Amino acid sequence: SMTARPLSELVERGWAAALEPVADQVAHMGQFLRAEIAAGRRYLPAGSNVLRAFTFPFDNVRVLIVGQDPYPTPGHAVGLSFSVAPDVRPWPRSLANIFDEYTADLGYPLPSNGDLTPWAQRGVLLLNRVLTVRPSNPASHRGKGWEAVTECAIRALAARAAPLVAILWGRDASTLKPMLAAGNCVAIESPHPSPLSASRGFFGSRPFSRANELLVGMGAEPIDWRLP
Numbered sequence: 001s002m003t004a005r006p007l008s009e010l011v012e013r014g015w016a017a018a019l020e021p022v023a024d025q026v027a028h029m030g031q032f033l034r035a036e037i038a039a040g041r042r043y044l045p046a047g048s049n050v051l052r053a054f055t056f057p058f059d060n061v062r063v064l065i066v067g068q069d070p071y072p073t074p075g076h077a078v079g080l081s082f083s084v085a086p087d088v089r090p091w092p093r094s095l096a097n098i099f100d101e102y103t104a105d106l107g108y109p110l111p112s113n114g115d116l117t118p119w120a121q122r123g124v125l126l127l128n129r130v131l132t133v134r135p136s137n138p139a140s141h142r143g144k145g146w147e148a149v150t151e152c153a154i155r156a157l158a159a160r161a162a163p164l165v166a167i168l169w170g171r172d173a174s175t176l177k178p179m180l181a182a183g184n185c186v187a188i189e190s191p192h193p194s195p196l197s198a199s200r201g202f203f204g205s206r207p208f209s210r211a212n213e214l215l216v217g218m219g220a221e222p223i224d225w226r227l228p
């Protein structure tokens with residue numbers, strides 16, 4: 001797959017072009033992971049899900065949501081940031097809190113499940129700064145080569161002749177703020193929704209309505225945030 005096949009196959013045609021400057025660095029990340037299995041350590045999510053955020057069209061992205069790194073618990077990380085498979089409960093405490101802020105912000109009721117597939121299908125890019133994690137070790141793949149990719153991805157978005165709003169959750173996500181120096185690309189910066197940091201100003205941050213206020217301001221269409 002990842003070290004084996006070129007971007008033209010792994011991601012959507014628009015992303016494959018945007019991420020051309022890190023084609024090798026993606027190849028390299030393929031190698032790093034094979035070495036992790038060889039050494040007898042695992043990673044999350046499954047090889048086929050690592051790049052999933054980029055299987056939705058690059059040209060369609062209106063909003064960017066950026067976490068730190070994938071759910072450390074087996075059966076959680078699906079390769080879209082904060083999403084879980086529809087049949088997963090309890091929701092990770094991180095998602096539960098994203099949903100409290102979601103009901104508070106937008107008025108809407110609690111989603112049925114934790115599948116955020118719909119946000120992705122509507123122009124929300126669900127990214128982590130880092131695309132893999134060793135199971136049960138938050139931040140274990142920090143500075144292993146993923147940063148250059150998620151930075152390239154963000155630069156390519158901001159370069160687009162397109163409106164962009166960026167929601168950056170936590171310090172690792174905020175390090176992408178400089179590449180969003182572009183004036184056709186505004187940024188919402190709040191603490192991470194994880195319990196450790198949520199009380200620190202995630203709660204009441206109102207990112208969803210504010211994102212939509214900013215999109216309307218750039219003559220772009222709001223995101224339909226509404227989840228089944």
Ligand SMILES: O=C(O)c1c[nH]c(=O)[nH]c1=O
Nearest residue numbers: 067068069070071081082
């Ligand atoms: O930034 C984060 O904490 C997360 C980002 N993406 C996920 O899939 N899970 C998380 O917990």
